Design a protein around this nucleic acid. Structure first.
Lengths: 56, 114, 122, 15, 209, 120
RNA sequence: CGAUGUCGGCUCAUCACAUCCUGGGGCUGAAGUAGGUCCCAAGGGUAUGGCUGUUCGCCAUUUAAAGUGGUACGCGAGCUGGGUUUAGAACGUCGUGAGACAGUUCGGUCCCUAUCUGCCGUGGGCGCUGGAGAACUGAGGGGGGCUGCUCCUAGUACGAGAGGACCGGAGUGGACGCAUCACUGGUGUUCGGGUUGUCAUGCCAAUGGCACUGCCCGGUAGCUAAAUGCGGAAGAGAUAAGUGCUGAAAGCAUCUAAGCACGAAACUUGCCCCGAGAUGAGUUCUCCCUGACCCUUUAAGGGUCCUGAAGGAACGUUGAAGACGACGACGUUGAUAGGCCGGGUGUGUAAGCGCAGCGAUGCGUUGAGCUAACCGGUACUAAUGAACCGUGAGGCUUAACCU
RNA sequence: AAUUCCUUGUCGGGUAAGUUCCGACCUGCACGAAUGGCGUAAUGAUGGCCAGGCUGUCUCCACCCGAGACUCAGUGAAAU
RNA sequence: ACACAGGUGGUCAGGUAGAGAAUACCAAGGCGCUUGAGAGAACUCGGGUGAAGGAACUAGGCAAAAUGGUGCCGUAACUUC
RNA sequence: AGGACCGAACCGACUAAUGUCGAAAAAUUAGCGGAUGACUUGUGGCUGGGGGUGAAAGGCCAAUCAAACCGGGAGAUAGCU
């Protein structure tokens, strides 16, 4: 339940080796408006695959 | 799948009479005694029917000399010969499992005759 | 499907009416008994003029089960009550002379010929 | 800053 | 004796003329074509590599496409290798069909069983479930004790406890083949085989003859 | 162990789950577009589309069959009158899912679910 | 003694052989059957209940046997608190008394979110050195190895009779283990129907909400066993106890000293699974890259431009795959998921209308209506063109074959 | 026996089998008449036993519905 | 000690079913309880169901399961009646 | 009529589970006993430390009781750690 000796910075650091975040690195430019967005996601303006899908 | 279907449809017997639960049928099954290929009878009330193609089965409850005897029958199995129906009951339930606790006058049902 | 402490009805005129199965014979750690297995039982109820009395320890063979016995074609024959026929302890011959209720075709095993001959059905 | 309920004591024996 | 690669099409039953029902497993066995014949000069042992089925020619990689190019066969789904038992000898491109089992009576079917995921000690190892009553607290389906006191001081290797169950290569031996239907490329074997419907199955004649 | 099964539990019981798909389909039919999470929009396809398919044939019992669902006379009046003939040619696929990012509140994955419509 | 939880029970077991059974043999006051004793052999198995808190023990019924020990008299950061061993009370006894008695009886808080070692699974990184996609060999490791009953041999051998074989073969069972829903069932709060009380849809009707899914009746697919299939092997090598052939020392004799043949569920294989991180990093097939410039402490160096191919990764649709990772299928050159059509399945004669009945209600329409996860089809919707990683022929020495 | 060490004293009943229970036998270590003795209708969240019904207690678990456990976003301890 | 599943005296308490202030649904009125969204693994808690057996489990029928209302019939030993 | 019966408010805590760094420094859930009386409760008082009070447990006396709490003798003493 409790530890007998405290973990070091090594044991803490080697545990956090897999806690690093992952980048997206796959930004897709829009077909018509040419704005960056995620794959299979609409843009902030409301464009998806060139069509103004949201009209809002 | 269709591969299952062609293997099953060549084993299903075409001449199957259409019976509903509650119908008092008379089933003849092939019984063997070593060298005696006999055909004994089993008459009772149908309480459960499941029709899954070749795996079609129906349950017949018969009140023998004493307690009742339940026996299912594989419809397309070669062990059965005739599934000829005597009476046509008038019930409104697919599974008549409540007939197990009723006996005597409380277990009989009405004729359909529609 | 008969195990220990199971109540069984008596399907012959041996005197008992209502018994207790106390041991499933025929193998170590054997749980259940078939429609053709020998089991050691004891008698919990008997008629006044019976051949046996309450509390006798003797062998019996199950002839009817509520679970039922499955035929090789895929069908099953399920009864509404667990019945049995009392047997002598030394010899597997039955004690009674008349048998009430039907039995199964699986009972034909060259030692129960006296049983299936007195059976009124199947 | 409070203490603790103290570990539940076992039934003490005798000679 | 070599085997062939099939596919589980699910199960059904066969009604014989005497009335007894035989629970069978329909296993379609397509035209297994040999892609490469391993020899002792290069590989040190004799075996044949075959394939079955077909694949769309857009999702096959260039290393796999070039491997089938010199083999003279179309790209099938996956590859399997069967050891030659010193008697038979095959050529690259020779198609083997289901009629090879028309003379044998017992075969072994190998497939990847159904994955049960992370299963408990009761399900995976048939452990006896503890008391569900009589004061029992939070220990209904736990494995209980896993070792002795101080003297070993560790849990022995191979200890039966919870873990991944299923999705494993399982071989069922001595299965009686009922029918070998050549024109439908089917194979009916008595009993059940590992794996779900549609999964790949490796069927070979029984070594425990 | 969830083999061959279907239907999202959504960390809720059956009574509440049926209740919102009664309510959310009414919001989808009324406004012709709503904003919800991606798993909720996916499970909404199996509710609104059978209602639209029922709306393709106008009868007497079908209105009562479409009134036991969504429990409002306005939506069943919105059905069978304009949404019926507007989907009379298409055979299925009356809705459309469009991912629009994540919720600012708890990073819940949003998506826009709407009919194949609104070119008026 | 600045804490090592004590008995018994449940679950989980591990090891030794001074072996309970199965197996292989010697002697027998071993006729056979059944035994008595001793040697080898730990591969597997090695009870259910009444009483008692009991381990133990008595008894009943089985089994081939219901083995003896060690593992903190195994196992409470796995469970119980019945006994023992707190605080109350009571009985017998002791003491004037407070109280006490391995004398008895009633009742009486069992805490901990795992840091490390260990074990079960499952991943990321790097390495194996040009990179990548597959198929494998196989070191090594793990799993399993139990046996009853019946028949033939043969009522033969043996035996006065009663009885009654060895050897070999076949069938059928118990337990265990593996796999799967083709059959029988269970579940199936995502399907249908019955029905009670109440509220609502303006009201009848028809519905919906709640009351454990309100209570029930069945029940699709999946899962599951009580269900259904399979297995323990046969054989080979080396052997233990044991049996031997020939044969000297020791002119004989002698299983041994030389040599040679048998001989067990014990050992290695043979059956199944994992497995090249086996850093001893393996083998085979296939695919891709064959462009120029400077600096230089001119070294398997660094930097610039142009190209970054095979393939992988990412994203989305997703799966009888899965905690998350991971694995598998598809992504329009589409059947991957959702929707739709037909069917199947399940529940049971829907709503509305008409007729009969004072009414409840019954009949026709109607085996209708509704159908979940099933089967076969169908791009109707969502799986976007692209971007990202991954490069430009792959070090030194020696040997053999061509220049 | 709330009392008895020997003791699971002996007999009978109950159970196939009962160190528990019930009725007796007195061989009462160490019962006994207001620290009351023997019974007693009714009463008791009192102690022990038995019988019927009932059932996942159990043979032997299996499935399903929810709340956690698991993943993601925000805040964010503790014993040691 | 907390924006704490605890405690806190008195008054009103309607509709339907119901003997009832029980209980179930509602009126008036007030709330959805100050972390949410996914997945539907082992395991923990609250539950639902179940073949055949029915206490064989266990110290012990612990826990669960089961009975359950009105009217009428009828109801034993014993007893302080 | 009843220290009568069943059973709500109310009072109490017999069993089991959860909870045991809890929602809670003894509570919740599902069952329980009394529930017209030796009942329960509000308000205001009285009885106090070798003392009060006790249908009696050596229980309660402000979450502390085989002698409450606070201050003072007092830096009691400690052959012990």
């Amino acid at each position: 339940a409790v530890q007998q000796n405290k973990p070091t910075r090594s044991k803490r650091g080697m545990r956090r080796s897999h806690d690093a975040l992952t980048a997206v690195t796959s930004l897709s430019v829009d077909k018509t408006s040419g704005e960056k967005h995620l794959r299979h996601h609409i843009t902030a303006d409301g464009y998806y695959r060139g069509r103004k899908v949201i009209a809002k | 799948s269709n591969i299952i279907k062609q293997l099953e449809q060549e084993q299903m017997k075409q001449d199957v009479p259409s019976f509903r639960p509650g119908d008092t049928v008379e089933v003849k099954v092939w019984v063997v005694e070593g060298s005696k290929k006999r055909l004994q009878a089993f008459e009772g009330v149908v309480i459960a029917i499941r029709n899954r193609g070749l795996h079609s089965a129906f349950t017949v409850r018969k009140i023998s000399n004493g307690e009742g005897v339940e026996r299912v029958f594989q419809t397309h199995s070669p062990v059965v010969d005739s599934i000829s129906v005597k009476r046509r009951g008038a019930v409104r339930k697919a599974k008549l499992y409540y007939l197990r606790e009723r006996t005597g006058k409380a277990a009989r049902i009405k004729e359909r005759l529609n | 499907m008969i195990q220990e402490q199971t109540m069984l009805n008596v399907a012959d005129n041996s005197g008992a009416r209502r018994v207790m199965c106390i041991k499933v014979l025929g193998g170590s750690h054997r749980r259940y008994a078939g429609v053709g297995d020998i089991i050691k039982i004891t008698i919990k109820e008997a008629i006044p003029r019976g051949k046996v009395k309450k509390g006798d320890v003797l062998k019996a063979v199950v002839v009817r089960t509520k679970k039922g016995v499955r035929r090789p074609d895929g069908s099953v024959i399920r009864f509404d009550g667990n019945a049995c026929v009392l047997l002598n302890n030394n010899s597997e011959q039955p004690i009674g002379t008349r048998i009430f209720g039907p039995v199964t075709r699986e009972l034909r095993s060259e030692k129960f010929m006296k049983i299936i001959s007195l059976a009124p059905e199947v | 800053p409070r203490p603790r309920p103290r570990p539940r004591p076992r039934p003490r024996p005798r000679p | 004796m070599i085997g062939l690669v099939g596919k589980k099409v699910g199960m059904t039953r066969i009604f014989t003329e005497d009335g007894v029902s035989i629970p069978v497993t329909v296993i379609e066995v397509e035209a297994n074509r040999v892609t490469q014949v391993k020899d002792l000069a290069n590989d040190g042992y004799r075996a044949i590599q075959v394939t079955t089925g077909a694949k769309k020619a857009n999702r096959v990689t260039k290393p796999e496409a070039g491997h089938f190019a010199k083999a003279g066969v179309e790209a099938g789904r996956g590859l399997w290798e069967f050891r030659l038992a010193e008697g038979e000898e095959f050529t690259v491109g020779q198609s083997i069909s289901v009629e090879l089992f028309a003379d044998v009576k017992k075969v072994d079917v190998t497939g990847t069983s159904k994955g049960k995921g992370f299963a408990g000690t009761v399900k995976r190892w048939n452990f006896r479930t503890q008391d569900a009553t009589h004061g029992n607290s939070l220990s209904h389906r736990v494995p209980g004790s896993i070792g002795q006191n101080q003297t070993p001081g560790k849990v022995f290797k191979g200890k039966k406890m919870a873990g991944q169950m299923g999705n494993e290569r399982v071989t069922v031996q001595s299965l009686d083949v009922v029918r070998v239907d050549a024109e439908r490329n089917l194979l009916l074997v008595k009993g059940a085989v590992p794996g779900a419907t549609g999964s790949d199955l490796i069927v070979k004649p029984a070594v425990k003859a | 162990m969830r083999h061959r099964k279907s239907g999202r539990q959504l960390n809720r019981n059956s009574s509440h789950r049926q209740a919102m798909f009664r309510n959310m389909a009414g919001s989808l039919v009324r406004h012709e577009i709503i904003k919800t999470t991606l798993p909720k929009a996916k499970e909404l396809r199996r509710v609104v589309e059978p209602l639209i398919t029922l709306a393709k044939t106008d009868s007497v019992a079908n209105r009562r069959l479409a009134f036991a669902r969504t429990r409002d006379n306005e939506i069943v009046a919105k059905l069978f009158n304009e949404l019926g003939p507007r989907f009379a040619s298409r055979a299925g696929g009356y809705t459309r899912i469009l991912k629009c990012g994540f919720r600012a509140g708890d990073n819940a994955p949003m998506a826009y679910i709407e009919l194949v419509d609104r070119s008026e």
